[PDB]
């Protein structure tokens, strides 16, 4: 019933917000729609897998907030396997490699690939993390899809195909679905292309021992009966002295402030009194989440390692159900597994099949890519199609179609009277990730502490000390990477010498 | 409590559905979120205006369903004033004209304009009204915005600027916001460019005497206590023998079937048990409504008529708050008024101002365009910003961003167990309009009648006889319009 702050949503962001407020001495209640906490994180446990992350899983250097929170809760990380060679599978053939970027030998194609990644980062540098709409060319870039940008930038099909896969994998959406400004912001606010795509030294370096679901679970353990499961929020009334929050199961909660820690669009599931301001009212109808099925195929042994493959496959082409895999074997070396994502339109297309049919297609793909008949002998399979989730809307996160971020972006974390906004979508560093969830939850919590006069304004946004356990190597470039011309750049250089 | 069919939403679509089912002998309940019916239609009455449509207003030839429904309810139409000249205001100057399309004199620009409109219709002919995702080039066209298409098609800035205005005015969204496939479908399913843009012999020919809100009001009068106002639906449970529908004010309704007659995205405001199928679950997060403020400035007299202007203004350019106006004077010739739309990003931008500040900006614009100081002396002002509406989401209708229609379009009117889908967005002829609202409401109603075994399958979709009061003249083209080359076509010929 009565409390200081109601947190709507018991994902990492809501739980981090609730914990901070609780630790500060406030009376908090977490209202969670599902019969579980964790939201877009979910760790399944059974005898066949021991544990497996079916939602958010990877953490890495520069994600210091999630690392710190998890460490405080008694959790540990381990390194995702990248000892052996990665595979880039292109036009029906596998090309093993090392280093984060799939290499190319053709001089023209090399210039094009180099320029593509470089340009993503160049453009990113013009985009403020906390205000992408303030980029000098914000409107121009927001009024273009990533498809248009790639069409302009990539002078080879090779680069365009890899760039497309990059977009699909990064934001679980098609290149034509998303704003170029938003996508460029998204990559930049994770630290750029190298950081976001890397396993070693990047976002995919690590996983939590026992699963990421433990973060939300262990905060629930700390909060006890303050977390209310199967309490979907249906109504928020701010017309009176205290804010009134009603749930579907007919309960009423009364608070001084509210934190909305749900995906922006899921705000639509709540009826507001008074109505939301016009800009937020429309914003929450313009911000869908991506489409993905996370699939884990289990094997007797990590047989790929014997062939000097680490388990990473970057698989181009329409025919492949999965465009990206990582070794998901336990740190102990047992429960051998390959994790793969079925992305964007393929998540829609292949959802029509049965679980067994998807398993078959994945095994046959992996057998081809790994050149290994052993891939046809799975021992177990788990999957989760996040498109079906009423209380997520999709995964990994919210994307912005062309035109939306410049028109509505400033609304995202603007308080509405006594409602403050958390959720990974409102983060400024690793938004879209568990890291961003922590940043946004704690920031929203501190906004309320400031509103209550408990902390000064300069304490709302707080820096995070670098993890001692997961130190971050700087992102470096070579002289040639910095200065080699683009394809059109080379052509202009030819034109001038000829004239 | 217990009934045959619960209709969620008391707009024209929900009301038309409820009326049909009621007339067939079923017990219907309409659950309406607001304290009024009509939804995206709203007629305000006061002494200063008598009545004024602040939402949907225009009807015209080929919209036979809304015309028939309104006639049955005892309503009449009158003709929007287009006796005198229209105005196209371009680069700070007014150019009066007659006919539906704003003309150009430069030969290259003429070819470009002619080709633009022609190409819109050419492309539309390949798009099935009832299945746009089945167009031969559906994916190619859906993966492009209208901005991209216009950049390809328009070889002159003149044509691109007019085409952009056309898009903004048609779908209250920016060219870069919307799918090319969806936009081309939208125009085609209204009968093409000429039909959609025309006052005389087109969508803007007429208004209802006394306001369009009377359609929903008069059906509410018929249904009596079956219409429940201030009953926002929050929960639908289909796990049991009868469907259970719960409202925000704590009431529970039990029915054999449900019609969802709300904008697709507003389905998000309802918690579903069991959860919606994946495709609908995501679809309803991908389909926003446009942005518009409808503004009506009142004057002592329709002074523009004295200068041989009808009141229609097509106003190019960023500076102009309003890109399009029509004479909104009563058929009797009193309550002289100009109706203007503030469109898309301008609705967002100018909402920051006060009502008085917007009035000043509109009056100064109209004075410039009409070349009349009289425009600076308004006697009254009414406006409505539809962006602020929790239970509409915007106006006029739902638009589809790139990639959405092909991936999710088939989901729109696919039943979910015992829930059937009405609402103008699900129509196949004048979707987006009051006409489409009627089509979809009656179709959804008949789906349920068929499910109950009361009518055969071939009766679900029903043709509509042409209105005797508002007959449609055919759309014609000239030989030169059909065969004159595009700009690139002329260049290839050279
Ligand atoms: C789903 C998912 C998946 C499948 C995956 C993933 C993910 C996801 N992610 C994301 C995460 O998870 C997120 O972010 C988080 O979790 C969020 O949180 P928050 O904010 O808190 O939210 P949520 O969870 O949702 O919560 C909410 C809550 O609430 C509730 N509700 C609702 N409604 C309501 C409620 N309540 C009451 N009432 C009402 N009304 C619900 O229920 C809930 O609970 C992630 N993340 C991280 O961190 N990590 C990871 O891993 C993840 N994942 C993924 C990712 C991937 N990635 C990374 C990828 C891989 C690779 C890559 C790349 O690379 C490349 O490209 N290459 C290599 C080529 C060259 C890049 C990029 C990307 C990537
Ligand atoms: C808003 C608006 C405005 C402002 C305007 C307009 C409109 C609108 N429109 C549309 C209409 O209105 C619609 O469609 C209808 O109404 C719809 O219906 P429905 O479907 O039924 O829906 P609604 O109404 O929304 O209803 C629903 C209901 O539900 C409820 N809810 C919600 N949620 C809920 C509920 N309940 C319970 N629960 C829950 N949860 C609500 O509340 C409601 O009630 C229109 N239409 C028509 O027809 N007409 C008109 O006029 C209109 N408007 C407009 C238009 C415009 N236009 C046409 C334009 C002008 C000119 C043009 C052109 O031309 C050109 O371009 N040029 C000349 C240049 C060269 C073209 C095109 C367009 C145009």
Domain ranges of chain A: 1-39+61-76+209-287+401-461, 40-60+77-105+198-208+288-400, 106-197
Q: At B279, give phi and psi (nearest 5°).
A: -65, -45
Residue A103 buriedness (CB in 10 A; 0-12 / 13-18 / 19+): exposed
Distance CA B202, CA B197 (A): 7
> What distance in angstroms lies between residue A434's CA and the mean position of ligand 1's atoms?
7
Strands ordered across the beta sheet of A5-8:
A227-229, A28-32, A5-8, A257-260, A419-421
Instruction: B186-190: list long-range contacts, CB under 8 Å, 24+ apart.
Output: B186/B431, B186/B432, B187/B120, B187/B121, B187/B124, B188/B121, B188/B124, B188/B125, B188/B127, B188/B129, B189/B129, B189/B427, B189/B428, B189/B429, B189/B430, B189/B431, B190/B429, B190/B430, B190/B432, B190/B433
Distance CA A382, CA A496 (A): 58
**Interface check B176 vs A, CB under 8 A:** yes
Nearest ligand 1 atom to the CA of A102 is 70
> Which of A433, A436, A442 is the pocket-test mutation for ligand 1 (most atoms within 8 Å of CB)?
A433
CB–CB contact B388 A278 (8 Å): yes
Nearest-CA distance B464 → chain A (Å): 34
**Interface check A288 vs B, CB under 8 A:** yes
Query: Cα–chain-centroid distance for residue A489?
Result: 34
Q: Cα separations (Å) of B236 from A377, B393, B419?
A: 44, 21, 9
Asked whether A139 and A110 are in contact (CB, 8 A), the reply is: no
Query: Cα–chain-centroid distance for residue A395?
Result: 8
Which of B349, B369, B345, B196 lies closest to B297, judged by CA? B369
> What distance in angstroms lies between residue B40's CA and the mean position of ligand 2's atoms?
5
**Rounded CA Rg of chain A:** 23
Residue A110 buriedness (CB in 10 A; 0-12 / 13-18 / 19+): middle
CB–CB contact B148 A148 (8 Å): yes
Burial A51-75 (b: 16+ CB within 10 A, else e): bbbbbbbbbbbbbbbbbbbbeebeb
Asked whether B281 and A388 are in contact (CB, 8 A), the reply is: yes
Find the farthest-apart pair of alpha carbons in chain A and give their distance in angstroms, rounded: 80
Query: Strand A380-385 relative to strand A292-298: parallel, antiparallel, unpaired?
Result: antiparallel
Q: Which helix H or strand E contains A165, and what residues bound it?
A: helix A157-171
Which of A250, A270, A274 lies closest to A259, judged by CA? A270
Specify the CATH architecture of the domain B40-60+77-105+198-208+288-400.
Answer: Alpha-Beta Complex (3.90)
> What distance in angstroms lies between residue A274's CA and the mean position of ligand 2's atoms?
23
Experimental method: X-ray
Instruction: A25-30: list long-range contacts, CB under 8 Å, 24+ apart.
Output: A27/A3, A27/A226, A28/A3, A28/A4, A28/A223, A28/A226, A29/A3, A29/A5, A29/A226, A29/A227, A29/A228, A29/A253, A29/A255, A30/A220, A30/A223, A30/A226, A30/A227, A30/A228
Asked whether A338 and A295 are in contact (CB, 8 A), the reply is: no
Q: Which of A248, A278, A288 sits opposite B282 (nearest CB)?
A: A288
Resolution for this PDB entry, in angstroms: 1.7
In A, minimum Cα distance to B232 occurs at A271
Query: Strand A337-343 relative to strand A324-327: parallel, antiparallel, unpaired?
Result: antiparallel
Handedness of CA A423, A428, A434, A435 (dihedral sign): negative
Alpha helices (H) in A38-145, listed in sequence order: 64-72, 107-124, 138-142
Distance CA A399, CA A167 (A): 11
Distance CA B13, CA B421 (A): 10
Distance CA B121, CA B188 (A): 7
Q: Which of A278, A287, A288 sits opposite B385 (nearest CB)?
A: A278
CB neighbourhood size of B23 (10 A): 11
Alpha helices (H) in B157-226, listed in sequence order: 157-171, 180-188, 193-197, 213-223
A143 neighbourhood in chain B, CB within 8 Å: 147, 174, 176
Distance CA B180, CA B175 (A): 9
**Interface check B150 vs A, CB under 8 A:** no
Pick the CATH number of A106-197 from 3.40.50.620, 3.40.190.10, 1.10.405.10, 3.40.50.360: 1.10.405.10
Distance CA A470, CA A405 (A): 33
Strands ordered across the beta sheet of B292-298:
B93-97, B85-90, B309-315, B324-327, B337-343, B292-298, B380-385
Distance CA B120, CA B356 (A): 39
Tokens of B85: 């000249």
Nearest-CA distance B265 → chain A (Å): 7
Q: Looking at the domain A1-39+61-76+209-287+401-461, which fold is it? A: FAD/NAD(P)-binding domain (3.50.50)
Q: Cα separations (Å) of B245 from A72, B188, B283?
A: 45, 37, 22
Distance CA B353, CA A278 (A): 13
Tokens of B379: 């006697």
Q: Cα separations (Å) of A140 from A406, B160, B172?
A: 10, 17, 20
Q: Which of B177, B288, B351 sits opposite A402 (nearest CB)?
A: B177
Name the β-bridge partners of A133: none
Measured from the CB, is residue A394 less than 6 Å from ligand 1? no
Q: At A162, give phi and psi (nearest 5°).
A: -70, -40
Residues 6+ positions from A229 with CB-CB distance below 8 Å: A10, A32, A34, A35, A36, A37
Asked whether A303 and A336 are in contact (CB, 8 A), the reply is: yes
């Amino acid at each position: 019933n009565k409390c200081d702050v109601v947190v709507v949503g018991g994902g990492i962001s809501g739980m981090a917000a609730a914990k901070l407020l609780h630790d500060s001495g406030l009376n908090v209640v977490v209202l969670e729609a599902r019969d579980r906490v964790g939201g877009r994180t979910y760790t399944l446990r059974n005898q066949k897998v021991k544990y497996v992350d079916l939602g958010g899983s990877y953490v890495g250097p520069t994600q210091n907030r999630i690392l710190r929170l998890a460490k405080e809760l008694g959790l540990e990380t381990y390194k995702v396997n990248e000892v052996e060679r990665l595979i880039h599978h292109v036009k029906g053939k596998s090309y093993p490699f090392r280093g984060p970027f799939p290499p190319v030998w053709n001089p023209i194609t090399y210039l094009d690939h180099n320029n593509f990644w470089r340009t993503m980062d160049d453009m990113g540098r013009e985009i403020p993390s906390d205000a992408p709409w303030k980029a000098p060319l914000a409107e121009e870039w927001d009024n273009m899809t990533m498809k248009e940008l790639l069409d302009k930038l990539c002078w080879t099909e090779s680069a365009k195909q890899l760039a497309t896969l990059f977009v699909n994998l990064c934001v679980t959406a098609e290149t034509h679905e998303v704003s170029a400004l938003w996508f460029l912001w998204y990559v930049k606010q994770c630290g750029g292309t190298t950081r976001i795509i890397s396993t070693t030294n990047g976002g995919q370096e690590r996983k939590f021992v026992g699963g990421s679901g433990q973060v939300s679970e262990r905060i629930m353990d700390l909060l006890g009966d303050r977390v209310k499961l199967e309490r979907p929020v249906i109504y928020i009334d701010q017309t009176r002295e205290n804010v009134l929050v009603e749930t579907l199961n007919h309960e009423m909660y009364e608070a001084k402030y509210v934190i909305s820690a749900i995906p922006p669009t899921l705000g639509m599931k709540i009826h507001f009194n008074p109505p939301l301001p016009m800009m937020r009212n429309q914003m929450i109808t313009r911000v869908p989440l991506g489409s993905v099925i996370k699939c884990i195929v289990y094997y007797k042994e990590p047989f790929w390692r014997k062939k000097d493959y680490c388990g990473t496959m970057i698989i181009d082409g329409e025919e492949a159900p999965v465009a990206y895999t990582l070794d998901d074997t336990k740190p102990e070396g047992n429960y051998a597994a390959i994790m793969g994502f079925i992305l964007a339109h393929k998540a829609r297309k292949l959802a029509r099949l049965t679980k067994e049919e998807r398993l078959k297609k994945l095994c046959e793909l992996y057998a081809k890519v790994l050149g290994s008949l052993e891939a046809l002998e799975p021992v177990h399979y788990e999957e989760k199609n996040w498109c079906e989730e009423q209380y997520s809307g999709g995964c990994y996160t919210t994307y912005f179609p062309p035109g939306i971020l410049t028109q509505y972006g400033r609304v995202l974390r603007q308080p509405v009277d006594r409602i403050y906004f958390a959720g990974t979508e409102t983060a400024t560093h690793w938004s879209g990730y568990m890291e961003g969830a922590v940043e946004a939850g704690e920031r929203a919590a501190r906004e309320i502490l400031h509103a209550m006069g408990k902390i000064p304004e300069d304490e709302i946004w707080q820096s995070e000390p670098e993890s001692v356990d997961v130190p971050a190597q700087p992102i470096t470039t070579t002289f040639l990477e910095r200065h080699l011309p683009s394809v059109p750049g080379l052509l202009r250089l030819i034109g001038l010498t000829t004239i």
